[PDB]
Coordinates of C-alpha atoms and ligand atoms in Angstrom, one line a residue:
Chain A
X281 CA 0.0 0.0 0.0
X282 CA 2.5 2.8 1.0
X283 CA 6.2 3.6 -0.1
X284 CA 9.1 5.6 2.0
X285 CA 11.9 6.9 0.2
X286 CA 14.8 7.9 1.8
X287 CA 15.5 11.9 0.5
X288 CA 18.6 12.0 2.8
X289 CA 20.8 9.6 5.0
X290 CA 23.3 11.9 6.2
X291 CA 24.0 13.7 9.5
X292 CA 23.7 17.7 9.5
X293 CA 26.4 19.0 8.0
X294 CA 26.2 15.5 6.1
X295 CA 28.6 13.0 4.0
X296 CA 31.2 14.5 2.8
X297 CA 31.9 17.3 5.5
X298 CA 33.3 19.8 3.8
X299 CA 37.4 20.6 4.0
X300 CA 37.3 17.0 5.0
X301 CA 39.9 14.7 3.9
X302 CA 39.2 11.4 5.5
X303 CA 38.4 8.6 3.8
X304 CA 35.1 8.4 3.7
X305 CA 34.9 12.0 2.6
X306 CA 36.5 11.2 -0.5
X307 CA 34.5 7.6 -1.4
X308 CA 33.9 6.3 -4.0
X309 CA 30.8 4.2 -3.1
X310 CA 27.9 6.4 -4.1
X311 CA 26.5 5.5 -0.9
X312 CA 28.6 7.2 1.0
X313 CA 27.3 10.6 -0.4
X314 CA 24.5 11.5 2.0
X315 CA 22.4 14.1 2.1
X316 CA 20.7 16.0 5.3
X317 CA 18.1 13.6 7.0
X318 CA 14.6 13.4 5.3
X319 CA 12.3 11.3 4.1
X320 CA 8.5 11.0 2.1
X321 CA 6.0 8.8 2.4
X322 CA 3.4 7.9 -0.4
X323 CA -0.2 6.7 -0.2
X324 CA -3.2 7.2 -2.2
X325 CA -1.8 9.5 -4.1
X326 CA -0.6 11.6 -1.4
X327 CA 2.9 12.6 -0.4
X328 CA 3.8 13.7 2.9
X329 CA 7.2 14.7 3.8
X330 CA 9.1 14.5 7.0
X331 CA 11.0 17.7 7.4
X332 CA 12.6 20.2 5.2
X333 CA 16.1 19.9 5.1
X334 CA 18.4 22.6 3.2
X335 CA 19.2 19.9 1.0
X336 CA 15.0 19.9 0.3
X337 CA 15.1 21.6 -3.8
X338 CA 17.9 18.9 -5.0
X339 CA 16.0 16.2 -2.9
X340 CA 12.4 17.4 -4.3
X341 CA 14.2 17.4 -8.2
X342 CA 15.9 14.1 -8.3
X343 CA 12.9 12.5 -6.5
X344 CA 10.9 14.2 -9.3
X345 CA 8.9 15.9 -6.5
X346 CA 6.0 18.0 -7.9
X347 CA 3.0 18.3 -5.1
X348 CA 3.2 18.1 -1.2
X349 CA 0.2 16.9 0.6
X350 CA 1.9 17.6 4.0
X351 CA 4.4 18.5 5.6
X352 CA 5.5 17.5 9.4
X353 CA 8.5 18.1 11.4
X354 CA 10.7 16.2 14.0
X355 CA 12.0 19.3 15.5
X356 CA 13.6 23.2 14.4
X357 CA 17.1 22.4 14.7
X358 CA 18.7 24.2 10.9
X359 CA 19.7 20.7 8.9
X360 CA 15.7 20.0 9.3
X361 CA 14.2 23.0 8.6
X362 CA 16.3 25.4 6.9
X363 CA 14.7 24.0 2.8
X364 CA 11.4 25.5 4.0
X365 CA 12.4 28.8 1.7
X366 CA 12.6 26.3 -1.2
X367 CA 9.2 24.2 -0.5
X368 CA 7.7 27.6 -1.7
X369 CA 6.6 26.9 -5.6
X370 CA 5.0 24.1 -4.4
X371 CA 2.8 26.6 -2.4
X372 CA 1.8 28.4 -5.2
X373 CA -2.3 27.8 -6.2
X374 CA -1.6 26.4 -9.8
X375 CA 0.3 23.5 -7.8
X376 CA -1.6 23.5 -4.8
X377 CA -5.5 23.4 -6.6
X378 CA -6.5 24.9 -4.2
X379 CA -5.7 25.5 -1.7
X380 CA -3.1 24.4 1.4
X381 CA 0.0 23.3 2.1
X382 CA -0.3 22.4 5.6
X383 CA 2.6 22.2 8.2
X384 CA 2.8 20.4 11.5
X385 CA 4.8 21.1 14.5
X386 CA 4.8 21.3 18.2
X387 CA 5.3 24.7 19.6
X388 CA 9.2 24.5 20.1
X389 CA 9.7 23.9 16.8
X390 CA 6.8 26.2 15.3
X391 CA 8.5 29.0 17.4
X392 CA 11.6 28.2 15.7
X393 CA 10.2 28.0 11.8
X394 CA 8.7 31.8 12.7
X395 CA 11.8 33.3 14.1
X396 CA 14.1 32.0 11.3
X397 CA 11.2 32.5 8.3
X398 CA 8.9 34.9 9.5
X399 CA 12.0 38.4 8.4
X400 CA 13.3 36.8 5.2
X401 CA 1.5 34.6 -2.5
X402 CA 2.8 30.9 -0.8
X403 CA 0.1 29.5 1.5
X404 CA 1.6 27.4 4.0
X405 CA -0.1 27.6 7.2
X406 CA 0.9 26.4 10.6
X407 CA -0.8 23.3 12.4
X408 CA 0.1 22.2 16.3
X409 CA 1.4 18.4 16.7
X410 CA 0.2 17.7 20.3
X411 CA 1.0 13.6 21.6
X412 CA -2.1 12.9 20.1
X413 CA -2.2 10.8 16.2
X414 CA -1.8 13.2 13.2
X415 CA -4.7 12.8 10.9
X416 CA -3.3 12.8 7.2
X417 CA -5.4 11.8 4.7
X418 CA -7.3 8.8 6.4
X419 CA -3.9 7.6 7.9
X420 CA -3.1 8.4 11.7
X421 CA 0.8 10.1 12.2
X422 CA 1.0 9.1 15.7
X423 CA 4.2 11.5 16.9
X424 CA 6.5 9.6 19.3
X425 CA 8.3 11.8 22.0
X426 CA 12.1 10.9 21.8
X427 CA 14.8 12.8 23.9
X428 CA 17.3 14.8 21.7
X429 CA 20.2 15.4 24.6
X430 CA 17.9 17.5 26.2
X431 CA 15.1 18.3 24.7
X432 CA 11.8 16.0 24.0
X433 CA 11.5 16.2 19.8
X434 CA 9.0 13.7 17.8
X435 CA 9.9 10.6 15.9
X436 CA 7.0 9.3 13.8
X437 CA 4.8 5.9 13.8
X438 CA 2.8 5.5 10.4
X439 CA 1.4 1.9 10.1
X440 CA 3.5 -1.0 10.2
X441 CA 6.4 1.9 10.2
X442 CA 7.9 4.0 12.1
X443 CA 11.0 7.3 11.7
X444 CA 12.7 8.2 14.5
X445 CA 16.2 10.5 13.8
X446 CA 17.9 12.4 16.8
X447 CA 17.3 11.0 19.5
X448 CA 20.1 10.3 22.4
X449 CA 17.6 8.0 24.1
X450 CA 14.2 7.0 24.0
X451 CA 11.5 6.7 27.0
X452 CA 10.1 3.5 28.2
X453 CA 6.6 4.3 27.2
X454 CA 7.7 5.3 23.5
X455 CA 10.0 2.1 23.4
X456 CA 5.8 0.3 24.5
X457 CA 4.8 2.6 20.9
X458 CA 7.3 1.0 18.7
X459 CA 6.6 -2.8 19.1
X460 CA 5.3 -4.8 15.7
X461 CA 7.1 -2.8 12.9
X462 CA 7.7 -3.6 9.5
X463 CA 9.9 -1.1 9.3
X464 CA 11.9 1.1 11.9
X465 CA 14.4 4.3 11.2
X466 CA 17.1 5.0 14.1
X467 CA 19.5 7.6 14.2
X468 CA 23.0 6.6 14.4
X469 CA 25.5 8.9 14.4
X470 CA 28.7 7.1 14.8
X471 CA 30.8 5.3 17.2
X472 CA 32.5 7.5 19.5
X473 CA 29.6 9.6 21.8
X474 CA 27.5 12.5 21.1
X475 CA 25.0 13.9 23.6
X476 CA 22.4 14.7 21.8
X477 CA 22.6 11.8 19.0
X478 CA 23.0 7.4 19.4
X479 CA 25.8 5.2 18.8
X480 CA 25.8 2.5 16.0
X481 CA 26.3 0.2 19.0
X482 CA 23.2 2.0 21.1
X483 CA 21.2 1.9 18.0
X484 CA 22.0 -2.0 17.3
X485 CA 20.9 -2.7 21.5
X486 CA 17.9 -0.6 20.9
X487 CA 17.0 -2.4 16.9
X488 CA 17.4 -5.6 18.5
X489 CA 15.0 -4.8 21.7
X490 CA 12.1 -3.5 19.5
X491 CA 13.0 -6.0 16.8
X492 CA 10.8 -4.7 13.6
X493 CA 11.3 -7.0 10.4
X494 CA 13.8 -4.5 9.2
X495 CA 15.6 -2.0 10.6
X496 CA 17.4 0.8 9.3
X497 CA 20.0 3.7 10.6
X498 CA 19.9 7.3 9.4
X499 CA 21.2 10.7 10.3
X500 CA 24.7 9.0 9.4
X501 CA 28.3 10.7 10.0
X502 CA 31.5 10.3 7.7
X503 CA 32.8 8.0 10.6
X504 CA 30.6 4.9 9.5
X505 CA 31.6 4.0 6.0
X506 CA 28.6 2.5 4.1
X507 CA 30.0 -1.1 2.7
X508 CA 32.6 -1.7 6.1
X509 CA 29.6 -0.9 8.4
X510 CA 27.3 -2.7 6.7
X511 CA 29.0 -5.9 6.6
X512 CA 29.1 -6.3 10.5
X513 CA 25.5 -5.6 11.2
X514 CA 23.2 -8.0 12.2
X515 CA 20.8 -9.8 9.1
X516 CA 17.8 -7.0 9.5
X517 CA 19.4 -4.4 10.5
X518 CA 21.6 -1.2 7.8
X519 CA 22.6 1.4 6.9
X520 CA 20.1 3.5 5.2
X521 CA 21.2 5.0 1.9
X522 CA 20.5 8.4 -0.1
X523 CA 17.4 7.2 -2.9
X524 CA 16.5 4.0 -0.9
X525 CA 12.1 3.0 -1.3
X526 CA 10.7 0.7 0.9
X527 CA 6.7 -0.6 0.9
X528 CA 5.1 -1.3 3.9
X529 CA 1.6 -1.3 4.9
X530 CA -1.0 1.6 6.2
X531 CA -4.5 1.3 7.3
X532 CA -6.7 3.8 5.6
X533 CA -10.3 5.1 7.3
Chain B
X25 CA 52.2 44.2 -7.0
X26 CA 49.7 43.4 -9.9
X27 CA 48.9 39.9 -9.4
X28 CA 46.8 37.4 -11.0
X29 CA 43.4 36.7 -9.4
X30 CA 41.0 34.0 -10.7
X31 CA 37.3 34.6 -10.5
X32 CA 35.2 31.8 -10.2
X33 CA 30.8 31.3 -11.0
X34 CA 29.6 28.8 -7.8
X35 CA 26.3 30.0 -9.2
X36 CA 24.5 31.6 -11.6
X37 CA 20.9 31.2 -11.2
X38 CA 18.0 33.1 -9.6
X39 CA 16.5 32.6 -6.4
X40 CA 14.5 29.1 -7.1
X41 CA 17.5 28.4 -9.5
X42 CA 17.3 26.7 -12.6
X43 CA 15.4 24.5 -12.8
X44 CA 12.3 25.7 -10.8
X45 CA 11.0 22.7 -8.6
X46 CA 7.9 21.6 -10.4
X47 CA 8.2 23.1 -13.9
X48 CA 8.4 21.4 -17.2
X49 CA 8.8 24.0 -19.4
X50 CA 11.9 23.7 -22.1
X51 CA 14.8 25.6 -19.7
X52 CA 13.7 23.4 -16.8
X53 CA 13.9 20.4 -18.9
X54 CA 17.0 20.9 -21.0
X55 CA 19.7 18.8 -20.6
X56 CA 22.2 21.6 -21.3
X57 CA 24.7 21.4 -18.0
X58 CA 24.8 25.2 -18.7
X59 CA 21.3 25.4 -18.0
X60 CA 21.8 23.9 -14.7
X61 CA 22.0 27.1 -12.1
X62 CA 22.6 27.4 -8.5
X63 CA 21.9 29.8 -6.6
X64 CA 24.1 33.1 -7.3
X65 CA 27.5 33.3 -5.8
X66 CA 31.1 33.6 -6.7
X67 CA 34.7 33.1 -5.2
X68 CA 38.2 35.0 -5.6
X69 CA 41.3 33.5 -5.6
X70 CA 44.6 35.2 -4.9
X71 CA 47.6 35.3 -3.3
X72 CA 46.7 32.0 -1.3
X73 CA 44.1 33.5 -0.6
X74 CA 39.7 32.4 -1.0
X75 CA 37.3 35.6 -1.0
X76 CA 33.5 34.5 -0.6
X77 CA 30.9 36.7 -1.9
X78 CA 27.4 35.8 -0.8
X79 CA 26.8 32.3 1.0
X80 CA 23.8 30.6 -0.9
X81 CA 21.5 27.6 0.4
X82 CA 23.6 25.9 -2.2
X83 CA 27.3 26.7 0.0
X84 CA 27.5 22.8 0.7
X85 CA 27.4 21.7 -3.0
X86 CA 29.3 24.6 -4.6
X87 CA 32.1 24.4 -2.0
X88 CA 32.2 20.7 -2.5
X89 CA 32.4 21.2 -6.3
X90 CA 35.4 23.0 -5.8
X91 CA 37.5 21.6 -3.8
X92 CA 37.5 24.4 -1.0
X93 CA 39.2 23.7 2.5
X94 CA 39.3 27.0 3.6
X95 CA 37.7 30.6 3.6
X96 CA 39.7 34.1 4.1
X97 CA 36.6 36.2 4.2
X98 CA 33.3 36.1 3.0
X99 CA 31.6 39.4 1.6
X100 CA 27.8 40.0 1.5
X101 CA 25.9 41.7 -1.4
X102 CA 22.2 41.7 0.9
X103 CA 20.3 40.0 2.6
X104 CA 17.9 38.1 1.0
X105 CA 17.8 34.5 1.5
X106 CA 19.2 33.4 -1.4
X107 CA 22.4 35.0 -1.0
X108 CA 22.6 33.9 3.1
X109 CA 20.8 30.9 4.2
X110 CA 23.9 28.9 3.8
X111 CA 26.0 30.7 6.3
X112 CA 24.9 27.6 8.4
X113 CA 27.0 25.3 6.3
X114 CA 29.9 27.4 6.7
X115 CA 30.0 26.0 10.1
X116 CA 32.5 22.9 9.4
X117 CA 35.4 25.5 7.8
X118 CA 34.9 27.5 11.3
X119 CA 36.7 25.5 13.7
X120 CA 40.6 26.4 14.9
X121 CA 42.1 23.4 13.1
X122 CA 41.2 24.9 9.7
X123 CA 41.1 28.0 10.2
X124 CA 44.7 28.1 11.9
X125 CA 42.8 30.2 14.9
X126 CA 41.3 32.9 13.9
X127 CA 37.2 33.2 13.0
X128 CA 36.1 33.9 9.5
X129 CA 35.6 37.0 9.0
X130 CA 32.0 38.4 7.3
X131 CA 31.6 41.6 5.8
X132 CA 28.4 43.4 5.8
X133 CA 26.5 46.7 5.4
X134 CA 24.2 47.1 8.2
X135 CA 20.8 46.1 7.3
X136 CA 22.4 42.6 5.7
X137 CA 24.2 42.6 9.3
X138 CA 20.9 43.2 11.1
X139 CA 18.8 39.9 8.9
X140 CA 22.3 37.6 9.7
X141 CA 21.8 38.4 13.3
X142 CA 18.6 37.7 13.7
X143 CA 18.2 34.7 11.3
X144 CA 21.1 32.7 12.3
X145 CA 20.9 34.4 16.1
X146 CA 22.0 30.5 17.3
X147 CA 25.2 31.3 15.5
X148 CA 25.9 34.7 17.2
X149 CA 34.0 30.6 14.7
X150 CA 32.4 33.7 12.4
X151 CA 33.0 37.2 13.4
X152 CA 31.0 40.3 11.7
X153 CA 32.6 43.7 10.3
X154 CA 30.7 46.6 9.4
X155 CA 30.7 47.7 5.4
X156 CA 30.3 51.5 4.2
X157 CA 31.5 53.2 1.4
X158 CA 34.7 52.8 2.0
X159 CA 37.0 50.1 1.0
X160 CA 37.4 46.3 2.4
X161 CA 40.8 45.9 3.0
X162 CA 41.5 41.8 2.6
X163 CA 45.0 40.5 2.8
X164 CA 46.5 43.8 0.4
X165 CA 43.7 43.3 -1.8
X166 CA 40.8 46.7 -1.8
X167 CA 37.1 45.2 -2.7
X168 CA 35.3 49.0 -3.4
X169 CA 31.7 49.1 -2.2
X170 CA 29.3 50.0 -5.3
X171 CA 25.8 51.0 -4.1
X172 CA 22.8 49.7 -6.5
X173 CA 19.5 49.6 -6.3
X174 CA 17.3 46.5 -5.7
X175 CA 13.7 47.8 -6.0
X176 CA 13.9 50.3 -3.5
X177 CA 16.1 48.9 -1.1
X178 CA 20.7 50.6 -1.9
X179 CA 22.8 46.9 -1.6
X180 CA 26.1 47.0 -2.8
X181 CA 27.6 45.1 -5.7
X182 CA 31.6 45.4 -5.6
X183 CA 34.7 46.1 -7.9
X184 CA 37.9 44.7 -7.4
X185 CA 40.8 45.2 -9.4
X186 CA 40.0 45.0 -12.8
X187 CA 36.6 42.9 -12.2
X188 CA 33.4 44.0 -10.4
X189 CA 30.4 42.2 -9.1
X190 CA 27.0 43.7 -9.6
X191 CA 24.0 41.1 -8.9
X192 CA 20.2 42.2 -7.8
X193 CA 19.7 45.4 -8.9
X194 CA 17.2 46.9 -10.7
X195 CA 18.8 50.5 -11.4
X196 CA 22.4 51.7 -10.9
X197 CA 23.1 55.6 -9.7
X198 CA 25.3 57.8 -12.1
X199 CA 27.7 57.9 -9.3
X200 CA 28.3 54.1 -9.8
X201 CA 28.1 53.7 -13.2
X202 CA 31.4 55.9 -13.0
X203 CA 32.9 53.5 -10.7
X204 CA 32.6 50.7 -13.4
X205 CA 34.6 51.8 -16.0
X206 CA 38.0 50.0 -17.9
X207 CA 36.9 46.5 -16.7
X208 CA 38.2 43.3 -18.2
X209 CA 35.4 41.6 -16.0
X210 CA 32.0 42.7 -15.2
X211 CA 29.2 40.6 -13.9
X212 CA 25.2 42.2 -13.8
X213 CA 22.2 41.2 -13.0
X214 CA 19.9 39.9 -16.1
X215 CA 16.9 37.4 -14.6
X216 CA 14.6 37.7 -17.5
X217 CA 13.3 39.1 -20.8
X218 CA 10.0 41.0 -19.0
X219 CA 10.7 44.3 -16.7
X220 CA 10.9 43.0 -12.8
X221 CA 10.6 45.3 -10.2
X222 CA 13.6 44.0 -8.6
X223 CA 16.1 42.8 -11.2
X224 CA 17.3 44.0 -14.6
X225 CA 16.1 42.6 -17.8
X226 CA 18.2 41.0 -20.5
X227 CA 18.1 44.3 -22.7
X228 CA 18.2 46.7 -20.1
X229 CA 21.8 45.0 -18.9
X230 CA 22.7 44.8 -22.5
X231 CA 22.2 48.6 -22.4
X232 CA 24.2 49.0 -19.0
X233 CA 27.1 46.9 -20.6
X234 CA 27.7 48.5 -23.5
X235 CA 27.7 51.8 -21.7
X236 CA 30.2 50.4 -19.4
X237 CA 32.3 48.8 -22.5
X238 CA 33.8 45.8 -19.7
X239 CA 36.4 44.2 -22.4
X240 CA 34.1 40.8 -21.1
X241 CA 30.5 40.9 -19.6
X242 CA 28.7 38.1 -18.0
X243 CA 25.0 37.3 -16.7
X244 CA 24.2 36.2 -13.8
X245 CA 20.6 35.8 -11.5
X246 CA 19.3 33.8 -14.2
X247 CA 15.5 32.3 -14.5
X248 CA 14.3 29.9 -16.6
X249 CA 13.4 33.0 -18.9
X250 CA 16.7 32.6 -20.4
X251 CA 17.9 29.4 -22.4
X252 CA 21.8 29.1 -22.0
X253 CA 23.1 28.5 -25.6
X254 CA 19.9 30.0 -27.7
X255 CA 20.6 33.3 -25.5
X256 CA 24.3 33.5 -25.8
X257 CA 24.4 32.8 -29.7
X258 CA 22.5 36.3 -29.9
X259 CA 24.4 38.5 -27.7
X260 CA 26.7 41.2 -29.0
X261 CA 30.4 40.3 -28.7
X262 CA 31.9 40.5 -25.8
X263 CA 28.5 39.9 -23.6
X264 CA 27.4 36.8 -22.7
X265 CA 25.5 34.5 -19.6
X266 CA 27.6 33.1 -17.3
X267 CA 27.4 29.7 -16.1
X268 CA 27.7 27.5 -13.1
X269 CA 31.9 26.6 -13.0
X270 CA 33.2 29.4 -14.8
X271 CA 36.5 30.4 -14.2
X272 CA 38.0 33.9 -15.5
X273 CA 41.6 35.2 -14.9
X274 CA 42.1 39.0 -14.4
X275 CA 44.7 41.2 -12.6
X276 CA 44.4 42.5 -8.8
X277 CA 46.8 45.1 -7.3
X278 CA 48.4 43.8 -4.1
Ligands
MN63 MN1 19.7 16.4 12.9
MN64 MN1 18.7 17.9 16.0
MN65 MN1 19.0 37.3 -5.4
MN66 MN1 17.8 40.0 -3.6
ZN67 ZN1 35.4 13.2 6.6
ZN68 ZN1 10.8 26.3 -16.0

């Protein structure tokens, strides 16, 4: 019924880092080019699209991107909101019917999108994500309160799947949200620590507690090189990579 | 102490770029690499030396594309977003261990100061000077302030040596159009055939340009108005669009 497709892999100031001269920085495994962490989700002809990172007008053209049904955000930090400006001609009315393009947030990151947007016609208009399900188009968004170092963001459950980038740990009563997945996004950053981001190895405990069908690691650093990483993971669990569609299923009402 | 300098195009497209998300028409669909633009932006080379002028949403790519692993300064034109919002991906070629210590310095007039501030306030590694009329002095080199007019709103395009960097205007004043003569390089502004109230037109830059008699004049802030090739085969001599990865030697005192 539904397909996700991976716009970005990559960590924030993603793969390469500029002026970077390690290896991975200079691959040549196409996978290790990442772009800033994103992905869509299709159903019923709709499109909805998990954050807008300033990577979003290259994503949106080599996806061949031409309407957004929605728009909803994990949280305001700059590598997942900052492509807003470029989501704008596909605000205009002669894409749009109509009518709206419609964004959801909670009020830490709406706050954000305003002060950064709001000094610098295109009909977005603001909707509040509370802890309750996300209604999209017959299919419930149920947001899933992670904790980003120190702050509480949203990961997403959508059906049998569920996105989740960000995060240095996530509450027992979300870990109780996540059970019976198809398919499961973590963040993994790396190896060495980051307080506001998880470990490959934190990410593998946390995959193999929830255990979804597949699994699948995102928000990626130039410290995990795509083909050496990949080859000591577990059977269901990756590295995702920039362009990768997956189908899974979503209840419609 | 004339030295060589080498100008180089990290973009040359309007705001949206070329192509515009969602279009179809012929520009959007060539397959022309020329007709490929990024968001408007170019760097100067000298002396060892890397001068950044605007920082576009597209900073990561462009600065990938060329190779850079360090910038001296970066110089702002305004501040609209597409000539700022990628002073966030700056960030990485910040740090002490590149940089050799210092922060990278920005150069700004005030109200292009006062939207930096304020947008990227969580930044505020980088370290902000004040532009006026008067000269930027960077490492021997003098980058002259030239006031334009966007709209309504004076920005400053900028001459340096024997190039000079106009972009975004709409109208330039007498008292600049003097500033702009015996050029080997000048860049304008041309985003379209049909008068904007923002930008200059195709034959109103023609105009400019051969009033300014620039021994080479290039386009830049280009929509999907303009096809690259068809355009370029009908410009007078000595006037042409730029493109995305042009590079252009000229001379630089100090
Ligand atoms: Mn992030
Ligand atoms: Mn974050
Ligand atoms: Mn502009
Ligand atoms: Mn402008
Ligand atoms: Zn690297
Ligand atoms: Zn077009």
């Amino acid at each position: 019924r539904a397909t996700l497709t991976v716009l970005g892999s990559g960590t924030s100031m993603g793969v390469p880092t500029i002026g970077c001269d390690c290896a991975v920085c200079s691959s040549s495994d196409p996978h290790d080019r990442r772009l800033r962490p994103s992905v869509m989700v299709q159903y019923d002809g709709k499109l909805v699209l998990i954050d807008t990172t300033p990577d979003f007008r290259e994503q949106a053209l080599r996806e061949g991107i031409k309407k957004i049904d929605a728009i909803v955000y994990t949280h305001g930090h700059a590598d997942h909101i900052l492509g807003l400006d470029d989501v704008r001609p596909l605000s205009f009315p002669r894409i749009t019917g109509g009518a709206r393009v419609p964004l959801y947030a909670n009020e830490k990151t709406e706050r954000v999108l305003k002060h950064v947007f709001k000094y610098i016609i295109a009909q977005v208009e603001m909707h509040r994500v509370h802890h309750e399900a996300i209604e999209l188009f017959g299919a419930k968004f149920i947001p899933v309160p992670v904790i980003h170092g120190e702050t509480e963001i949203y990961g997403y459950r959508f059906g049998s799947a569920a996105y989740l980038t960000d995060f240095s740990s996530i509450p027992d009563a979300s870990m109780e949200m996540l059970r019976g997945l198809d398919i499961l996004f973590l963040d993994a950053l790396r190896h060495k620590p980051h307080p506001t981001h998880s470990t490959l190895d934190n990410s593998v405990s946390i995959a193999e507690k929830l255990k979804a069908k597949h699994t699948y690691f995102t928000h990626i650093s130039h410290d995990l090189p795509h083909e050496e990483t990949n080859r000591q993971l577990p059977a269901g669990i990756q590295l995702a990579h920039d362009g990768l569609k997956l189908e899974f299923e979503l209840c419609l009402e």
